[PDB]
Symmetry: D2
Subunit: 259 residues, 4 copies
């Protein structure tokens, strides 16, 4: 049609809020301000308590929360079947889910366990494939799926180890989904976020060193936050990004472009 960022009459599933620092919460704040109906997903019960507390910050009249552990085909198939009944058809999904064992992230990459490797692949990459298959059922008119990645999918970064191979997998997942679901007018894209202080990120060594290197070396000489990812998520989830699919947008102050 034309260029509009008015997301009234739009419904978006947002997977992977855990606390106020979660990137997916940044996405939620932004989509909320633009007047979208938001469905939320969580794994742990601690995340449900946090979500209910955080909905007070939003202008969401009715809370729709669904527990989905992406490790379970059943929790994913049932979760999306249930969303279809409770809220009906949706316009897109924001995927903000990743995990690896701290054991495998400290080790030399060559020491990585078969279990730690396939675990990282399962949660951080395959989750997008099954989520896409199910969400498709609620998007007969078309829609937009967005996953969150890191530069470590494209380059060997110190300490990212097994998560780098998971993100490389995720980034190829996005391309293959984009080619598969394109004929159904479903767009699939990734956001490569710069480093952000979150629940997942807190408790890895010298994370403050990486934040300082970005401020020093990145073109914009600053770090990014959850809302900047949110703004780009709005572009990719809305029809502003029509004709964009299989794309990876770096929201990282230009760090990807330098060496």
């Amino acid at each position: 049609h034309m260029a509009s960022l008015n997301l009234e009459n739009k419904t978006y599933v947002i997977m992977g809020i855990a606390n106020k620092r979660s990137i997916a919460f940044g996405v939620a704040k932004v989509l909320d301000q633009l007047g979208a109906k938001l469905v939320f997903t969580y794994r742990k019960e601690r995340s449900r308590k946090e979500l209910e507390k955080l909905l007070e910050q939003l202008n969401q009249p009715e809370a729709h929360l669904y527990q989905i552990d992406v490790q379970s085909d059943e929790e994913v198939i049932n979760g999306f079947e249930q969303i279809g009944k409770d809220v009906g058809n949706i316009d897109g999904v924001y995927h903000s889910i990743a995990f690896a064992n701290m054991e495998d992230l400290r080790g030399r990459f060559s020491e990585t366990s078969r279990e730690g490797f396939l675990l990282a692949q399962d949660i951080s990459s395959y989750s997008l494939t099954i989520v896409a298959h199910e969400a498709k059922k609620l998007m007969p008119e078309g829609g937009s799926i967005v996953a969150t990645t890191y530069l470590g999918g494209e380059f060997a970064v110190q300490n990212y180890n097994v998560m780098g191979v998971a993100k490389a997998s995720l980034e190829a997942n996005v391309k293959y989904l984009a080619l598969d679901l394109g004929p159904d007018n479903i767009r699939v894209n990734a956001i490569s976020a710069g480093p952000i202080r979150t629940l997942s990120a807190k408790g890895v060594g010298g994370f403050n060193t990486i934040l300082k290197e970005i401020e020093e070396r990145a073109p914009l000489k600053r770090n990014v936050d959850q809302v900047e990812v949110g703004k780009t998520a709005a572009y990719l989830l809305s029809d502003l990004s029509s004709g964009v699919t299989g794309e990876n947008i770096h929201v990282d102050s230009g760090f990807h472009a330098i060496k």
Copy 2:
């Protein structure tokens, strides 16, 4: 109070490279207009000025500000931007939609390309962005956003693109080096890689209809794109929606870049 906003009132954007209603830059203009931006326009030929004045009737621009700039001339570019600074004041960004090569060099085997045809393509299609950026910077002391238009032929050897492929590769590196230079001045530099669109430049190149049909057949979205889709992405990149994005190349091409 809105964090994420596409409200471009109180924003001024220079748009270089409108020639007719089919121009990609016109798609950009229609979109930025609808979002309530003040638009300055640039043209080379007089045919383009006549067309621009006729087309402003389609827009909600109260005052027409047109400036003749041939990007081959340091003086026309330096003077044009000095004049825009006086007439409209400080700007928030520039959309660059300018390219040219001799049809001679685009038909030939790439190895037959003339030194003159090669350096001409570089001058208009790549260096133009460097000098435009240097001058526009003077009108963006608070920061801003520069966007150039490229094609997948900058990244891969495509049949018949020849000398323009090497110009676009040059443009795409230009964007990265400008992004690194002007980043500390809070100026973002990015490119849009547009899929094929029927325009004045594109009409009269061989079997262009073959390329449009291959996109519809092989590209993920099984369809071609238009000037407005480029316009929408231009709005994202020129607005503060794209804050934290610089040195980036967004493919608006129905996913064609992602497949093989």
Copy 3:
């Protein structure tokens, strides 16, 4: 001194199954350059074929070891045993991949969790564990090479789950290169163009892809197992010193065009 004389060099070659195997192309080439070759196989059908094929080579002593890369034990034990039988090695050529035909025909979005993680296990993780063990036999340094396809870099029709496995493999190579670089171990990939092999025979319209290469690729021709072998020789020898984390396309220039 620039030399392709591989006397006094020993190379493990994983993934020979028949005479059409890419790894066999690698073996023929390394043999002609006078290298001692250790071989690995999974199925017994592959052992029978290997013994028959060693007659075509100038290998005095046959060293065959059964390793299924799905098993930590078969991989750890296989490489411990190679260390005893032949001693220290100079590199490993990895030519191993697998996915369920089920998942390769389906729309990629239909892919099963089992089919996906299986492809990752054999086609990508195998390189990580192989590298960990082979390192033990390369205290002076060495070269590891894995085989990939352009489908790791771009979505190609019908490659589906194997594309995501190859994307994983190609990142594996980069992360191994960064980890084992300080131990003077180089890790690189060869992106082979399409070749008629046992694995490749019986997948839909493979003859369409071979014809598109001959028509559209810069060299207007397909490649064979030996061309991969020649590039494998470069990457496994010290000719490629200073090259690590690299992906060489042996594909008639197809990767460079669109």
Copy 4:
């Protein structure tokens, strides 16, 4: 009888861009010499001819064939290659090790770059390969291999590379478009992306010792590369060992391209 062979007897290679003993192209020459190849050399300045004659004593080249070619001149390039065709006959490939930009443009902020400095860098550092390829093709009716030398700054914005980064991006696209054009004539075109090396061109740029130290600290192999390592990879790419490889860019840089 050897499928895989690095025996370059009965092979003739033109090597453009030796200036002194530290030149990358000299590393290429030493390696190709040891493998028993007939080597033709090219130079611009007379200082380079004196140095070349002195350096031929280090090689096992029976007959010295030196030709002055300034790649800025179509005539010097067309005539030089016509003359090589008469003196030595048909060749098997060309190693291109030629680049230049004004020190003025390499110190400045990239946005300050002059139109003259930009197009000069493009002319010598990129177009030179196109015209050299067109002429050398005439001496390679059976096929052959052309190799150009590039730097990571063609792919990423690196501090201080400025206008040479845009030239190398141009060169790297040149290689792809030449590979597609000359492939049917069985001519392969590839690039080597060398890590940083102490040479005549490189000496006298600021904090070059900082970049060498960052490579030793951060690159996978925790060491820098030299002219011979580039030479070894040049041997692979120029010989038939690299058959089926064209439009490729091999990083000889201790793995630095693969990390971030």
